[model samples]
Target: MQIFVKTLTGKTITLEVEPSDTIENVKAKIQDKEGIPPDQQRLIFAGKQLEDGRTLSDYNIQKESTLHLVLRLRGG
Candidate 1:
Protein backbone atom coordinates (compact mmCIF):
# COMPACT_ATOMS: atom_id res chain seq x y z
CA MET A 1 0.00 0.00 0.00
CA GLN A 2 1.02 3.62 -0.37
CA ILE A 3 1.10 6.32 2.31
CA PHE A 4 0.42 10.00 1.72
CA VAL A 5 1.76 12.45 4.27
CA LYS A 6 1.43 16.22 4.55
CA THR A 7 3.74 18.30 6.68
CA LEU A 8 3.01 21.40 8.71
CA THR A 9 4.59 23.48 5.95
CA GLY A 10 2.09 22.17 3.43
CA LYS A 11 4.64 19.88 1.86
CA THR A 12 3.21 16.53 0.85
CA ILE A 13 5.00 13.35 -0.11
CA THR A 14 4.15 9.76 -0.84
CA LEU A 15 5.83 6.71 0.58
CA GLU A 16 5.67 3.01 -0.06
CA VAL A 17 4.17 1.69 3.15
CA GLU A 18 2.55 -1.44 4.44
CA PRO A 19 -0.56 -1.77 6.54
CA SER A 20 1.53 -3.97 8.79
CA ASP A 21 3.97 -1.18 9.45
CA THR A 22 3.97 0.60 12.78
CA ILE A 23 3.41 4.34 13.19
CA GLU A 24 7.05 4.77 14.11
CA ASN A 25 8.18 3.15 10.88
CA VAL A 26 6.31 5.77 8.92
CA LYS A 27 8.21 8.51 10.73
CA ALA A 28 11.52 6.91 9.82
CA LYS A 29 10.47 6.85 6.22
CA ILE A 30 9.52 10.50 6.42
CA GLN A 31 12.88 11.36 7.91
CA ASP A 32 14.66 9.80 4.96
CA LYS A 33 12.57 11.66 2.44
CA GLU A 34 12.46 15.13 4.06
CA GLY A 35 15.47 15.04 6.40
CA ILE A 36 13.18 15.50 9.37
CA PRO A 37 14.25 14.04 12.66
CA PRO A 38 12.31 11.07 13.95
CA ASP A 39 12.74 12.33 17.49
CA GLN A 40 10.69 15.39 16.67
CA GLN A 41 8.04 13.59 14.72
CA ARG A 42 4.28 13.27 14.97
CA LEU A 43 1.74 11.62 12.71
CA ILE A 44 -2.01 11.99 12.88
CA PHE A 45 -4.79 10.53 10.79
CA ALA A 46 -8.53 10.88 10.94
CA GLY A 47 -7.90 13.62 13.48
CA LYS A 48 -6.26 11.15 15.83
CA GLN A 49 -2.60 10.92 16.73
CA LEU A 50 -0.90 7.70 15.76
CA GLU A 51 0.64 5.61 18.51
CA ASP A 52 4.05 4.11 17.90
CA GLY A 53 3.21 0.54 18.76
CA ARG A 54 0.04 0.41 16.72
CA THR A 55 0.18 -0.90 13.22
CA LEU A 56 -1.25 1.09 10.37
CA SER A 57 -3.99 -1.48 10.22
CA ASP A 58 -4.84 -0.75 13.81
CA TYR A 59 -6.15 2.61 12.80
CA ASN A 60 -7.83 1.17 9.70
CA ILE A 61 -5.43 3.21 7.61
CA GLN A 62 -5.67 2.01 4.09
CA LYS A 63 -3.88 2.81 0.91
CA GLU A 64 -3.71 6.37 -0.37
CA SER A 65 -4.91 7.90 2.88
CA THR A 66 -3.40 11.23 3.83
CA LEU A 67 -1.68 11.53 7.19
CA HIS A 68 -0.63 14.74 8.87
CA LEU A 69 2.91 15.04 10.12
CA VAL A 70 4.28 17.62 12.50
CA LEU A 71 7.97 17.81 13.15
CA ARG A 72 8.95 20.22 15.88
CA LEU A 73 12.36 21.40 16.98
CA ARG A 74 13.62 23.10 20.12
CA GLY A 75 15.00 26.65 20.28
CA GLY A 76 11.88 28.69 19.95
Candidate 2:
Protein backbone atom coordinates (compact mmCIF):
# COMPACT_ATOMS: atom_id res chain seq x y z
CA MET A 1 0.00 0.00 0.00
CA GLN A 2 1.03 3.57 -0.51
CA ILE A 3 1.22 5.95 2.41
CA PHE A 4 1.28 9.72 2.38
CA VAL A 5 3.45 11.59 4.81
CA LYS A 6 3.83 15.28 5.58
CA THR A 7 7.11 16.75 6.62
CA LEU A 8 7.65 19.48 9.17
CA THR A 9 8.20 21.85 6.26
CA GLY A 10 4.75 20.97 4.97
CA LYS A 11 6.11 18.99 2.05
CA THR A 12 4.13 15.88 1.26
CA ILE A 13 5.73 12.66 0.05
CA THR A 14 4.49 9.25 -0.88
CA LEU A 15 5.90 6.07 0.57
CA GLU A 16 5.28 2.59 -0.75
CA VAL A 17 5.03 0.19 2.14
CA GLU A 18 3.29 -2.96 3.21
CA PRO A 19 0.87 -3.44 6.08
CA SER A 20 3.40 -5.72 7.71
CA ASP A 21 6.08 -3.02 7.61
CA THR A 22 7.08 -1.60 10.97
CA ILE A 23 7.14 2.12 11.74
CA GLU A 24 10.91 1.90 11.98
CA ASN A 25 11.01 0.60 8.46
CA VAL A 26 9.14 3.62 7.23
CA LYS A 27 11.48 5.86 9.17
CA ALA A 28 14.48 4.32 7.42
CA LYS A 29 12.98 5.08 4.05
CA ILE A 30 12.25 8.62 5.13
CA GLN A 31 15.83 8.92 6.25
CA ASP A 32 17.04 7.99 2.79
CA LYS A 33 14.67 10.37 1.06
CA GLU A 34 14.62 13.26 3.50
CA GLY A 35 18.05 12.81 5.08
CA ILE A 36 16.50 12.59 8.52
CA PRO A 37 17.90 9.77 10.58
CA PRO A 38 15.46 7.09 11.69
CA ASP A 39 16.39 7.73 15.30
CA GLN A 40 15.65 11.43 14.82
CA GLN A 41 12.37 10.96 13.04
CA ARG A 42 9.16 10.94 14.97
CA LEU A 43 6.01 9.79 13.25
CA ILE A 44 2.58 10.83 14.36
CA PHE A 45 -0.76 9.53 13.21
CA ALA A 46 -4.26 10.25 14.46
CA GLY A 47 -2.76 12.55 17.05
CA LYS A 48 -0.73 9.76 18.62
CA GLN A 49 2.90 8.78 18.43
CA LEU A 50 3.62 5.80 16.19
CA GLU A 51 5.84 3.29 17.92
CA ASP A 52 8.85 1.77 16.14
CA GLY A 53 7.83 -1.80 16.95
CA ARG A 54 4.27 -1.35 15.69
CA THR A 55 3.22 -2.40 12.24
CA LEU A 56 1.38 -0.06 9.92
CA SER A 57 -1.62 -2.35 10.13
CA ASP A 58 -1.45 -2.24 13.90
CA TYR A 59 -2.45 1.39 13.69
CA ASN A 60 -5.04 0.52 11.08
CA ILE A 61 -3.24 2.75 8.60
CA GLN A 62 -4.97 2.74 5.28
CA LYS A 63 -3.74 3.64 1.84
CA GLU A 64 -3.06 7.33 1.40
CA SER A 65 -3.26 7.87 5.14
CA THR A 66 -1.46 11.02 6.16
CA LEU A 67 1.35 10.64 8.67
CA HIS A 68 3.03 13.65 10.20
CA LEU A 69 6.80 13.46 10.44
CA VAL A 70 8.59 15.55 12.97
CA LEU A 71 12.31 15.81 13.62
CA ARG A 72 13.46 15.27 17.16
CA LEU A 73 15.24 18.30 18.56
CA ARG A 74 18.52 18.06 20.34
CA GLY A 75 19.93 20.40 22.91
CA GLY A 76 23.58 21.38 22.87
Candidate 3:
Protein backbone atom coordinates (compact mmCIF):
# COMPACT_ATOMS: atom_id res chain seq x y z
CA MET A 1 0.00 0.00 0.00
CA GLN A 2 1.16 3.50 -0.78
CA ILE A 3 0.44 6.25 1.72
CA PHE A 4 0.57 9.97 1.04
CA VAL A 5 1.47 12.18 3.96
CA LYS A 6 1.37 15.95 4.23
CA THR A 7 3.45 17.52 6.96
CA LEU A 8 2.57 20.56 9.00
CA THR A 9 5.57 22.20 7.39
CA GLY A 10 3.74 21.82 4.09
CA LYS A 11 6.05 19.11 2.79
CA THR A 12 4.67 15.97 1.23
CA ILE A 13 6.10 12.46 1.24
CA THR A 14 5.00 9.10 -0.08
CA LEU A 15 5.60 5.86 1.75
CA GLU A 16 5.14 2.27 0.73
CA VAL A 17 3.71 0.26 3.60
CA GLU A 18 1.92 -2.96 4.39
CA PRO A 19 -1.80 -3.09 5.10
CA SER A 20 -1.10 -4.55 8.52
CA ASP A 21 1.20 -1.75 9.52
CA THR A 22 0.24 0.36 12.50
CA ILE A 23 0.19 4.14 12.64
CA GLU A 24 3.29 3.97 14.83
CA ASN A 25 5.06 2.07 12.09
CA VAL A 26 4.39 4.88 9.64
CA LYS A 27 5.38 7.44 12.23
CA ALA A 28 8.72 5.69 12.68
CA LYS A 29 9.31 5.86 8.97
CA ILE A 30 8.43 9.54 9.00
CA GLN A 31 10.82 10.04 11.87
CA ASP A 32 13.59 8.38 9.93
CA LYS A 33 13.07 10.66 6.96
CA GLU A 34 11.67 13.81 8.58
CA GLY A 35 13.49 13.76 11.94
CA ILE A 36 10.24 13.95 13.87
CA PRO A 37 9.75 11.50 16.68
CA PRO A 38 6.62 9.37 17.00
CA ASP A 39 5.66 11.02 20.27
CA GLN A 40 5.90 14.40 18.66
CA GLN A 41 4.01 13.41 15.55
CA ARG A 42 0.26 13.75 15.18
CA LEU A 43 -1.49 12.02 12.31
CA ILE A 44 -4.98 12.67 11.02
CA PHE A 45 -6.83 10.63 8.45
CA ALA A 46 -10.39 10.78 7.31
CA GLY A 47 -10.87 13.73 9.61
CA LYS A 48 -10.05 11.59 12.67
CA GLN A 49 -6.92 11.23 14.73
CA LEU A 50 -4.85 8.15 13.96
CA GLU A 51 -3.90 6.01 16.90
CA ASP A 52 -0.49 4.40 17.13
CA GLY A 53 -1.91 1.05 18.21
CA ARG A 54 -4.31 0.80 15.31
CA THR A 55 -3.55 -0.89 12.02
CA LEU A 56 -4.04 0.83 8.69
CA SER A 57 -6.81 -1.54 7.84
CA ASP A 58 -8.50 -0.79 11.13
CA TYR A 59 -9.05 2.75 9.93
CA ASN A 60 -10.02 1.63 6.43
CA ILE A 61 -6.93 3.17 4.94
CA GLN A 62 -6.48 2.31 1.33
CA LYS A 63 -3.88 2.66 -1.32
CA GLU A 64 -2.80 6.22 -1.99
CA SER A 65 -4.59 7.37 1.13
CA THR A 66 -3.52 10.80 2.34
CA LEU A 67 -2.77 11.54 5.99
CA HIS A 68 -2.02 14.86 7.59
CA LEU A 69 1.03 14.97 9.84
CA VAL A 70 1.50 17.61 12.48
CA LEU A 71 4.30 18.04 14.92
CA ARG A 72 3.24 18.68 18.49
CA LEU A 73 4.12 22.13 19.75
CA ARG A 74 5.38 22.84 23.25
CA GLY A 75 5.71 26.01 25.24
CA GLY A 76 6.21 26.98 28.82
Candidate 4:
Protein backbone atom coordinates (compact mmCIF):
# COMPACT_ATOMS: atom_id res chain seq x y z
CA MET A 1 0.00 0.00 0.00
CA GLN A 2 1.07 3.54 -0.70
CA ILE A 3 0.48 6.27 1.87
CA PHE A 4 0.63 9.99 1.32
CA VAL A 5 2.32 11.97 4.09
CA LYS A 6 1.89 15.69 4.69
CA THR A 7 4.53 17.34 6.80
CA LEU A 8 4.51 20.46 8.93
CA THR A 9 6.77 22.12 6.42
CA GLY A 10 3.89 21.97 3.92
CA LYS A 11 5.56 19.24 1.93
CA THR A 12 3.81 16.11 0.74
CA ILE A 13 5.65 12.83 0.23
CA THR A 14 4.34 9.47 -0.85
CA LEU A 15 5.61 6.25 0.66
CA GLU A 16 5.18 2.61 -0.19
CA VAL A 17 4.09 0.98 3.03
CA GLU A 18 2.89 -2.47 3.88
CA PRO A 19 0.20 -3.69 6.22
CA SER A 20 2.97 -4.81 8.58
CA ASP A 21 4.61 -1.40 8.61
CA THR A 22 4.29 0.39 11.89
CA ILE A 23 3.96 4.08 12.63
CA GLU A 24 7.64 4.09 13.53
CA ASN A 25 8.47 2.81 10.08
CA VAL A 26 6.62 5.68 8.48
CA LYS A 27 8.18 8.14 10.88
CA ALA A 28 11.64 6.95 9.93
CA LYS A 29 10.81 7.38 6.27
CA ILE A 30 9.51 10.87 6.90
CA GLN A 31 12.63 11.70 8.87
CA ASP A 32 14.78 10.43 6.03
CA LYS A 33 12.81 12.41 3.46
CA GLU A 34 12.44 15.62 5.44
CA GLY A 35 15.79 15.51 7.21
CA ILE A 36 14.16 15.23 10.60
CA PRO A 37 14.89 12.80 13.40
CA PRO A 38 12.53 10.04 14.39
CA ASP A 39 12.48 11.26 17.97
CA GLN A 40 11.24 14.61 16.72
CA GLN A 41 8.52 13.12 14.56
CA ARG A 42 4.90 13.11 15.60
CA LEU A 43 2.45 11.30 13.38
CA ILE A 44 -1.23 11.95 13.91
CA PHE A 45 -3.91 10.14 12.07
CA ALA A 46 -7.51 11.04 12.88
CA GLY A 47 -6.46 12.97 15.99
CA LYS A 48 -4.59 10.20 17.68
CA GLN A 49 -1.00 9.69 18.72
CA LEU A 50 0.71 7.14 16.52
CA GLU A 51 2.34 4.74 18.90
CA ASP A 52 5.67 3.26 17.93
CA GLY A 53 4.67 -0.36 17.61
CA ARG A 54 1.27 -0.01 16.05
CA THR A 55 0.79 -0.96 12.43
CA LEU A 56 -0.98 1.29 9.90
CA SER A 57 -4.08 -0.89 10.06
CA ASP A 58 -4.05 -0.77 13.84
CA TYR A 59 -5.00 2.87 13.66
CA ASN A 60 -7.76 2.25 11.16
CA ILE A 61 -5.60 3.44 8.31
CA GLN A 62 -6.94 2.53 4.89
CA LYS A 63 -5.22 1.97 1.58
CA GLU A 64 -4.04 5.01 -0.34
CA SER A 65 -4.55 7.02 2.84
CA THR A 66 -3.07 10.32 3.86
CA LEU A 67 -1.19 10.77 7.13
CA HIS A 68 -0.29 14.02 8.85
CA LEU A 69 3.24 14.23 10.27
CA VAL A 70 4.02 17.09 12.61
CA LEU A 71 7.72 17.61 13.24
CA ARG A 72 8.77 19.23 16.47
CA LEU A 73 11.42 21.95 16.46
CA ARG A 74 13.05 24.08 19.12
CA GLY A 75 13.28 27.79 18.48
CA GLY A 76 12.36 31.21 19.74
TM-score for candidate 1, residues paired by index: 0.87
By TM-score, who's the top model here? 2
- Per-residue lDDT tens digits for candidate 1, residues 1-76, read 9879887788879988878888887788767877877788877788887776789998998879998876664322
Which residue pairs does candidate 3 place in steric collision? none
lDDT of each: 0.80, 0.84, 0.83, 0.76
Q: For all the candidates, what are their Cα RMSDs to the real structure?
A: 3.1, 3.0, 3.0, 3.2
Q: TM-scores of the models, in the given order? A: 0.87, 0.89, 0.89, 0.82
Q: Residue-wise lDDT of candidate 4 within 11-72, one digit each (tens)?
A: 88888878777788777776677677888777777777678767888887877788787667
Best by lDDT: 2
lDDT score of model 3? Answer: 0.83
How many clashing residue pairs appear in each of the predictions shown?
0, 0, 0, 0
Candidate 2 local lDDT, residue 16: 84
Question: Per-residue CA lDDT of candidate 3, range 1-76, in tens?
Answer: 8889987778889999999988888888877987778888778888888775779999999989998876785321
For candidate 2, lDDT tens digit of each residue in 1-76? 9899987787999988899988898888877887788887788889888886779999999979998877885321
What is the alpha-carbon lDDT of model 4 when measured against the actual structure?
0.76
Off by over 4 Å in 3: 73-76
Error of 2 at 31 (Å): 1.5
